């Protein structure tokens with residue numbers, strides 16, 4: 001009996017989740033639920049396409065619903081809602097709002113008797129686990145998290161005269177990283193830890209100074225990080241702009257433990273993690289478990305379709 | 317009440333656990349059990365040193381016993397023995413014998429109603445978690461594990477005529493790592509993945525070709541890997557070839573996509589000793605909750621490792 005998966009939202013993440021289900025023979029995607037009218041959305045797999053309102057009607061059909069919407073607006077509304085009617089997975093990433101979010105989701109999920117696993121993914125998710133592990137292995141110390149990865153632009157930069165193409169990355173600041181690696185235990189602000197790099201391909205004839213000036217006028221350009229604009233070629237952007245990754249460093253009073261992740265060729269980590277956690281949620285539900293869970297609550301064996309004995313044999 | 321800990325075995329690992337306990341104020345170290353004459357065991361703290369033979373009589377005075385014995389000969393007997401009387405933690409590392417170990421510990425633990433967590437540490441332990449995570453994330457692919465670390469030197473190298481000083485390390489074979497990282501999905505044997513690198517200072521009048529031959533053919537614990545010998549100066553052993561970082565990485569290569577999970581240990585963090593202490597806290601909690609039987613790191617949720625409340629861990633770390 002295939003596990004039954006329902007997907008909410010058909011953005012990049014939702015598409016990734018759909019892709020990842022294809023490598024999980026033990027599951028069947030049964031439906032995609034969309035914030036757009038379903039008729040206007042072309043889903044790649046040959047499966048039911050429904051509106052979000054329609055979901056309340058599909059409780060019997062789906063085992064686990066994977067919420068693939070964005071954290072800033074969709075998830076706060078979506079998580080405590082779908083929790084009322086289904087076992088859910090999500091990638092909620094607003095750290096400051098996690099406790100409030102967990103609580104709202106837990107109140108729904110306890111009342112409805114369903115398992116909801118929040119905040120699955122690289123960070124939160126794997127990185128959160130790294131932070132906890134660093135703490136229990138060096139209990140007196142400081143924790144630092146650094147990421148390097150592509151980030152969404154401010155259609156705005158693309159409407160600036162002379163901009164042919166643009167892509168943006170968050171990168172760790174080298175001076176800050178060194179400081180932490182040396183066991184100095186620095187006090188680092190958000191702004192001190194990472195910088196934005198905006199890579200821009202100019203149209204032939206464009207003035208770099210004007211294009212930069214215009215980019216810096218974009219609303220909220222200077223809000224949380226400092227940003228450098230770099231003008232490069234189309235070929236340069238393609239060749240060197242690449243692998244998302246980061247690292248969590250625990251620095252004792254010098255004792256340093258560093259946990260890292262590198263992703264190459266678009267693995268779609270978080271999408272695939274949602275699918276693995278979906279399996280864990282299904283098993284817990286089956287056991288009469290309920291309410292909100294985070295990665296701190298989920299044993300890793302529940303993630304694999306293999307038997308515990310098999311996991312011991314092959315991977316331990 | 318504090319979690320009462322006992323240590324069985326006082327090797328470097330046992331010593332590491334003693335030290336780690338000092339950073340965990342919710343725990344109290346009750347005693348150290350040893351096969352050696354207790355008066356001759358130089359324990360750092362003021363903890364009582366006892367014969368291992370008498371550990372059973374401390375059944376009611378210890379919550380969790382952390383077994384720091386060697387995987388090859390100590391643990392195979394000690395694990396199932398101690399899980400009759402105590403919740404237990406160990407770092408059993410003989411991957412091929414894990415199912416048989418697990419079963420024996422499990423049988424003992426189920427019958428006593430204790431919790432036994434086995435095979436805790438960097439590898440097995442964290443790396444095992446990495447291999448799992450790689451598999452679930454990229455179900456169709458290959459896993460490769462690489463480690464770089466110094467050795468216990470279980471030494472006979474130091475007794476080779478002409479060898480003044482030596483240090484040995486297990487290193488990844490770069491070219492094998494490069495094939496993995498390129499997405500070749502190479503079929504790699506144990507011997508293909510790591511080399512033993514032995515750095516040697518030569519005694520006056522030594523015959524290096526004899527010294528090398530003999531290191532290369534000497535019966536050793538790491539027979540599985542080929543050994544490369546590098547003659548260097550004592551000045552250079554010290555500058556370049558001491559206190560190296562231990563660490564490694566687990567690579568999942570699927571389809572072309574690569575996910576790499578790394579660990580770096582710097583300045584002797586004593587990862588495994590510390591991990592054993594954290595997992596002791598989880599064993600005690602599972603025990604307090606009526607659980608029993610053998611567990612692995614695949615069975616233990618992370619929140620249990622921390623003395624913080626679940627709500628605090630969500631607030632501070634998630």
Ligand SMILES: NC(=O)C1=CN([C@@H]2O[C@H](COP(=O)(O)OP(=O)(O)OC[C@H]3O[C@@H](n4cnc5c(N)ncnc54)[C@H](OP(=O)(O)O)[C@@H]3O)[C@@H](O)[C@H]2O)C=CC1
Pocket residue numbers: 324325326327328329330349350351352357368384385386387388390407408409410435436437438439440441468588
């Ligand atoms: N990542 C992982 O999961 C890891 C697993 N391990 C495993 O843990 C095992 C133990 O490691 P380690 O402690 O370094 O091995 P040691 O050889 O240092 O210690 C093993 C045993 O030998 C005896 N011993 C050794 N040295 C002394 C000493 N100076 N004084 C008194 N007794 C001593 C101890 O018993 P007694 O006190 O009774 O004499 C101890 O139980 C290894 O076999 C390894 O496989 C290790 C590290 C990481």
Ligand SMILES: NCCCCC(=O)C(=O)O
Pocket residue numbers: 438439440463465562
């Ligand atoms: N093989 C990698 C794990 C090694 C753990 C260990 O034996 C050590 O760190 O000394």
